[PDB]
Ligand binder design. Structure first.
Ligand code: HEM
Ligand code: HEM
Ligand code: HEM
Ligand code: HEM
Ligand SMILES: [Cl-]
Ligand SMILES: [Cl-]
Ligand code: NA
Lengths: 106, 106, 107, 105
């Protein structure tokens, strides 16, 4: 049943990668944790994603947080697929984390 | 940064339940989803938790969101344990969800 | 009456207890506040001097705020400040002094 | 984390810490507004009001600043040994008493 869930820290590093995220993206949770979230997308988003997070931390002007967007994901096997993305922010131990929920559109 | 994560909707219904949550509380994600998150807690919190959610949706005045709190959790086998909670708020598909990080303090 | 935001420190300003209402007011959970100096809860230069306030009190026994209370400026985890009324008590446990603080948010 | 209770100076519970709830079995909301004498067996239970009143008149302490091992009572009625430390503080010209409870079990 459930959609894929990914948590990142304030610098884009994967901290949690749900069971449905493993099935969808192909990475095991252990492989995904400690990698930049930018591994889960094609170019050009892959190269720009660090700047997207940094721009948000500086300005607190959201573009997908609380808004959602249809984007293209990339699996461990290199294939791409359309997906809808919802993102949230929270604080834990005084530091920011971002929660993403991924609906596989295919 | 704890590995146990739970996501609820705006009525306290479990939407996602991470593998570490499963081990800690003793409920599988498949069983957990669709149940109120209050199954994971002892009284008196159990019977009041819906009112805490509704109160927050009314006031927007967090008691735990962005602050954190040590509370008592209850496992499926009825045993209780100290845990720290970090809760965040997010929106997906136009509705609120709450993201909870659970740190077992046993 | 008395406030529900209560803080207990030892004789060196280290937080020992941090009540639920104090967590909400200051934005720190007890897990992180306990073991830190109470001076984390105040702006400068009070923060840098608060240890001296306590230690000089323990040597002189001349109270300023104890038993009287005072409106002071507090500071939250997120760095925002706010006026607050502070009531302080002193007690002994196991031959060591502790101080009990009750905080009223005046925002 | 240790059990703390604050009374007014008729013995009514004002604050009841999380460790206090775990120890005595009363929720904070239940405890607040009850006389602290609920937390002890007889004969102390029936006499505790007089002890506070006697302190307020005489200012002669017996446990304040001194401490004592006494017997406490849980909500479920069971008794247990505990060490108590008590302090006084004022606000509004009215005393409040702060109690720290060590469960000796
Ligand atoms: C895997 C496919 C993903 C793609 C293609 C993607 C793409 C993008 C894009 C295009 C933006 C900038 C939006 C704009 O400027 O219009 C952005 C921002 C951001 N993304 Fe992602 N992202 C993906 C996954 C994630 C995940 C899983 C998370 C968190 C777990 C995340 C966190 C963020 C954050 C925190 C921002 C800054 C906040 C904002 O601008 O609203 N991203 N992303
Ligand atoms: C399982 C053990 C849990 C316990 C004992 C518990 C207890 C509480 C308490 C006591 C409050 C109110 C604070 C107060 O009135 O002083 C509260 C509020 C709330 N809880 Fe929980 N909770 C638990 C788990 C969760 C989880 C896992 C989530 C979300 C995934 C959650 C979501 C919320 C929300 C949204 C509020 C209101 C927001 C706020 O006041 O900051 N709870 N909870
Ligand atoms: C967080 C905001 C606080 C501020 C801005 C603050 C400020 C001060 C100041 C300015 C003094 C010296 C008073 C003077 O000499 O005129 C003082 C003394 C003192 N404070 Fe604090 N304080 C704070 C919190 C606390 C808390 C929560 C406690 C105890 C739980 C505490 C315990 C003491 C003690 C024991 C003294 C010396 C006793 C006395 O002067 O009567 N303080 N504080
Ligand atoms: C729950 C178990 C408790 C027991 C068995 C107990 C027992 C006693 C006894 C025997 C005395 C008289 C001392 C004497 O005459 O030698 C006394 C006095 C007193 N108690 Fe308690 N007490 C308990 C809890 C508390 C708590 C939790 C507080 C405050 C938060 C408190 C506040 C006082 C005060 C203010 C006095 C008078 C002050 C003094 O004589 O030092 N008591 N108590
Ligand atoms: Cl003592
Ligand atoms: Cl002792
Ligand atoms: Na009550």
């Amino acid at each position: 049943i459930p959609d894929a869930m990914i948590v990142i820290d304030g610098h884009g590093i994967i901290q949690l990668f749900s069971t449905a995220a493993e099935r969808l993206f192909g990475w095991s949770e252990l492989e995904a944790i400690g990698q930049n979230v930018n591994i889960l997308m094609p170019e050009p988003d892959r190269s720009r994603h660090d700047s997207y997070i940094s721009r948000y931390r500086t300005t607190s002007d959201p573009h997908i947080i609380g808004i959602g967007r249809i984007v293209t994901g990339k699996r461990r096997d290199g294939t791409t697929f359309p997906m809808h993305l919802s993102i949230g922010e929270m604080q834990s131990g005084g530091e920011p984390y971002f929660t993403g929920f991924v609906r596989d559109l295919t």
